[PDB]
Amino acid sequence: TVKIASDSSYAPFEFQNGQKKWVGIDVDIMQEVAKINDWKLEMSYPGFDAALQNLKAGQVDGIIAGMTITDERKETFDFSNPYYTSALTIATTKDSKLSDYSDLKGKAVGAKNGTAAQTWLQENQKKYGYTIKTYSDGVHMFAALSSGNIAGAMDDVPVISYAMKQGQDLAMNFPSISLPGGYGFAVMKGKNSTLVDGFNKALAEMKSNGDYDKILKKYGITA
Numbered sequence: 001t002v003k004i005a006s007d008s009s010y011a012p013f014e015f016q017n018g019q020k021k022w023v024g025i026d027v028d029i030m031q032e033v034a035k036i037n038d039w040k041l042e043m044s045y046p047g048f049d050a051a052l053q054n055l056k057a058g059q060v061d062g063i064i065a066g067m068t069i070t071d072e073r074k075e076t077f078d079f080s081n082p083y084y085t086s087a088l089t090i091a092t093t094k095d096s097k098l099s100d101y102s103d104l105k106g107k108a109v110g111a112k113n114g115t116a117a118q119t120w121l122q123e124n125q126k127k128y129g130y131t132i133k134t135y136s137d138g139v140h141m142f143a144a145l146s147s148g149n150i151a152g153a154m155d156d157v158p159v160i161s162y163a164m165k166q167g168q169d170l171a172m173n174f175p176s177i178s179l180p181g182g183y184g185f186a187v188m189k190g191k192n193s194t195l196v197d198g199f200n201k202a203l204a205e206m207k208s209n210g211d212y213d214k215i216l217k218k219y220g221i222t223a
């Protein structure tokens with residue numbers, strides 16, 4: 001088998017539909033990577049930093065979870081070629097009057113544990129003077145956002161946008177931070193090299209034959 005761990009709630013990359021079924025961009029791509037490569041694919045959805053721990057323990061073989069490729073992360077993981085862009089911004093409720101990172105001084109800002117959002121928040125904390133609240137789970141972070149206990153939640157643009165499209169009480173009034181790495185498939189550094197190659201080879205074939213484009217189209221994304 002090939003065991004891949006993912007997030008539990010990260011629409012449109014992985015999420016459950018109305019019949020409790022796991023769907024999303026990451027799900028469609030990984031299933032297709034497995035078919036093209038003839039892998040028995042065993043997906044699990046424990047959560048992002050849960051998936052990180054399962055990967056480092058060897059309980060799974062790699063991760064697909066909207067995971068941003070970063071230079072720092074490249075010291076623990078090997079990544080595929082990117083298959084999506086990676087950008088961060090502040091979600092707020094619709095009725096929020098905050099719009100700039102300078103507004104967050106002396107306020108509590110959420111981030112999911114182990115993520116590029118938490119890293120950026122940590123790197124820019126002295127600059128803007130917010131306090132960082134951490135949650136492993138996106139459900140907990142956005143519950144805090146809705147409850148008013150955090151002034152904003154940093155997360156990835158496509159995920160906030162998608163849920164805004166679902167009519168959730170969310171707005172994107174802040175500038176976005178573009179991260180250069182994009183999203184990749186990740187394995188432990190020096191391990192499972194051929195999973196990365198298989199991912200790369202299938203992804204190129206999916207771009208050239210147009211299956212990649214069709215996956216993004218399913219979820220409302222113009223590529």
Ligand SMILES: NC(=O)CC[C@H](N)C(=O)O
Pocket residue numbers: 007010048065066067068069086112114115116117156
């Ligand atoms: N599933 C996630 O929350 C991933 C968030 C972000 N792209 C990261 O890589 O940390």
Ligand code: NA
Pocket residue numbers: 069070071072180181
């Ligand atoms: Na980087």
Ligand code: NA
Pocket residue numbers: 070116119120179
């Ligand atoms: Na970063």
